[PDB]
């Protein structure tokens with residue numbers, strides 16, 4: 243349950259305060275994945291089937307934009323495909 | 325002789341993801357009103373579906389305009405771009421959010437209690453999926469791909485290339501041989517820096533430059549404001565609040581007054597939803613235009629005349645904005 | 654192409670097989686058609702259910718009102734029912750008009766895509782799919798059209814030490830088509846997208862003024878293709 247625009251004072255450890263609202267019933271993951279359910283303010287919940295603990299669980303992680311790249315620009319270097 | 329003139333071009337990309345609830349708006353949190361509203365039928369499901377479709381389409385517009393890059397590129401620590409100064413458009417790490425000098429001049433001339441009144445009546449405003457931080461990071465990745473990798477970062481894998489060599493492609497693409505660039509490189513860099521300074525000065529003069537975003541927000545705000553004021557309408561009943569109709573009359577005679585009030589309020593809310601749908605369709609057309617502009621001007625070089633700004637277009641630098649995007653052609 | 658024709662044909666056949674396999678996996682690929690049909694079907698379905706609404710009247714079917722009340726008192730109930738049903742039908746018509754305008758925009762986009770991507774080769778970047786566009790194959794679909802954009806994607810890279818121009822005897826030398834690259838010792842002039850190295854003759858390169866004004870120029874002896882011919 244996602245309580246939008248609620249001060250979360252009225253309706254443990256299952257909460258997670260997002261800028262959209264506190265998501266009760268989802269555990270945060272500090273790793274960022276590509277997200278399929280859009281939630282709000284960069285948060286996306288998803289269903290994670292893990293064979294170790296909590297095979298039925300919903301994780302609310304910050305949205306990942308993609309693989310960060312560090313292309314090495316040089317004033318005399320070019321990259322031409324072969 | 326030639327001159328390079330940076331031209332700003334503003335395009336709305338999305339509007340506020342609003343949301344309306346019947347029993348909060350149509351009913352003043354009463355019970356008999358809820359009975360009558362459920363008696364009318366399934367208009368509320370249609371209204372909620374339409375508004376959720378509007379919100380989904382706005383989210384898709386925002387995610388399609390900006391997220392045209394699979395990878396988030398970064399500018400190199402050194403800035404040897406052949407004398408070309410990009411400190412104004414490149415990200416500024418001073419802010420906690422990786423915005424830029426020109427992006428900051430945009431977020432201050434829009435500015436997007438009345439909000440509490442709308443919230444208490446069920447007229448909530450959902451937050452966008454992409455915050456200004458991730459939109460700014462998408463713009464920074466686009467800038468890094470354009471400056472360092474030229475335009476091949478859109479076709480396939482990004483390929484590093486000297487900036488003084490990248491612009492040797494674009495002149496040769498607009499007819500002028502690259503020797504003209506390679507003999508007048510310092511002059512071109514000076515003109516480009518001067519043009520960036522001039523466009524920054526113009527952005528730091530008046531908000532009337534951003535006359536499109538200040539309309540995509542002011543029209544939705546006015547629509548919500550005039551939807552709020554429809555609750556202060558008699559609509560034929562002897563009052564305008566449903567707590568002063570059930571406190572005066574009895575059910576068999578108060579049902580007609582409540583029916584009048586509910587049909588009037590439902591008509592007003594349906595009018596608001598239709599206006600919102602039409603405006604969302606127009607914004608979708610504008611976002612498609614912005615998407616193709618960023619797909620052609622930024623990710624390459626358009627041969628279309630007067631599309632990517634007047635004159636033979638060389639390149640573009642996408643920049644974030646409040647509910648929109650501005651190009652620096 | 655004329656040196657790698659068989660390789661390109663094999664890659665194209667493999668790509669067609671892969672897109673066939675992807676189409677034979679899930680319907681989520683056709684997420685647009687399954688919406689242009691489902692939204693209209695759902696709109697018709699929710700228009701049907703509005704006939705089951707009292708709208709204030711003491712019933713919901715017009716045969717159980719004229720079988721209970723008399724004309725002078727049944728007319729008010731019928732007016733209630735008719736204004737409610739007309740409002741619902743007008744709402745459906747407005748939704749259909751808005752969706753038809755959106756579909757008209759989509760069909761204009763499809764028409765221009767067929768007119769440029771298929772009937773030619775568009776220079777527009779990322780219009781006819783990601784990467785450079787070779788050709789497109791339109792295919793029918795239920796209330797729609799699917800394009801199979803054949804695209805040119807560079808696969809593997811290799812760094813080179815480039816150079817904006819070349820000093821020979823004080824005169825600058827710029828490549829008329831391609832760029833100057835070096836594999837460590839020598840120099841070559843190659844096309845931008847593909848690494849096909851060629852020696853720097855006087856055909857691949859043109860002169861423009863001296864070579865002390867251009868920034869970043871390097872030294873090399875451009876092989877004049879007439880020296881062995883003028884020696885004899």
Ligand SMILES: *[C@@H]1O[C@H](CO)[C@@H](O[C@@H]2O[C@H](CO)[C@@H](O)[C@H](O)[C@H]2NC(C)=O)[C@H](O)[C@H]1NC(C)=O
Nearest residue numbers: 325326327328508510511512513514515516518
């Ligand atoms: C092309 O135009 C530029 C811009 O007007 C010229 O650069 C100016 O040159 C004058 C003297 O020729 C200087 O006094 C200015 O300070 C220059 N301005 C800038 C911004 O550099 C350039 O000289 C012109 N080129 C030719 C061949 O006439």
Ligand SMILES: *[C@@H]1O[C@H](CO)[C@@H](O[C@@H]2O[C@H](CO)[C@@H](O)[C@H](O)[C@H]2NC(C)=O)[C@H](O)[C@H]1NC(C)=O
Nearest residue numbers: 403407408409410411412425517518520521524
């Ligand atoms: C690029 O341009 C910016 C701004 O046009 C330059 O920053 C200015 O630098 C001068 C000298 O250091 C300062 O007096 C100004 O206060 C700076 N202004 C701003 C807005 O930062 C920057 O030096 C330029 N860099 C290059 C390499 O040309």
Ligand SMILES: *[C@@H]1O[C@H](CO)[C@@H](O[C@@H]2O[C@H](CO)[C@@H](O)[C@H](O)[C@H]2NC(C)=O)[C@H](O)[C@H]1NC(C)=O
Nearest residue numbers: 324657659660661662663664665666667808809
């Ligand atoms: C370019 O890439 C293609 C596709 O990866 C290569 O074609 C494959 O090459 C390997 C080894 O030569 C063969 O085992 C495969 O059967 C080939 N596949 C196809 C579909 O032809 C090609 O060799 C690469 N060319 C170069 C010069 O690296």
Ligand SMILES: *[C@@H]1O[C@H](CO)[C@@H](O[C@@H]2O[C@H](CO)[C@@H](O)[C@H](O)[C@H]2NC(C)=O)[C@H](O)[C@H]1NC(C)=O
Nearest residue numbers: 813814834835836837838839840841850851852
């Ligand atoms: C760069 O490419 C040139 C191509 O001419 C290489 O020169 C020849 O490379 C072949 C490789 O099979 C050798 O057998 C020849 O002896 C080389 N010289 C000549 C005159 O043909 C060169 O080795 C490559 N690498 C560098 C660092 O220059």
Ligand SMILES: *[C@@H]1O[C@H](CO)[C@@H](O[C@@H]2O[C@H](CO)[C@@H](O)[C@H](O)[C@H]2NC(C)=O)[C@H](O)[C@H]1NC(C)=O
Nearest residue numbers: 819820821822823824864865869870871872873
């Ligand atoms: C490129 O080659 C030329 C010719 O061999 C070198 O000649 C220089 O020319 C400048 C301009 O007149 C003189 O000031 C230098 O004294 C010349 N060099 C010598 C050694 O006499 C030039 O130095 C070479 N440049 C590079 C970057 O390799």
Ligand SMILES: *[C@@H]1O[C@H](CO)[C@@H](O)[C@H](O)[C@H]1NC(C)=O
Nearest residue numbers: 246247248249250440443444
């Ligand atoms: C939360 O606090 C604010 C400020 O007092 C108040 O306006 C609002 O009604 C409260 N309740 C919410 C958002 O549910």
Ligand SMILES: *[C@@H]1O[C@H](CO)[C@@H](O)[C@H](O)[C@H]1NC(C)=O
Nearest residue numbers: 269270271272273274301303
């Ligand atoms: C959260 O951060 C901790 C360390 O701060 C890390 O060990 C953990 O893997 C992260 N993710 C969780 C708890 O899902």
Ligand SMILES: *[C@@H]1O[C@H](CO)[C@@H](O)[C@H](O)[C@H]1NC(C)=O
Nearest residue numbers: 316317318319402403404405
């Ligand atoms: C430009 O390239 C040369 C050659 O490697 C290098 O020495 C120089 O440092 C580069 N320029 C800058 C500003 O680093």
Ligand SMILES: *[C@@H]1O[C@H](CO)[C@@H](O)[C@H](O)[C@H]1NC(C)=O
Nearest residue numbers: 313314319321810811812813
């Ligand atoms: C090119 O150089 C960069 C940085 O020096 C390196 O990361 C990359 O692997 C190189 N690519 C090739 C093909 O050598």
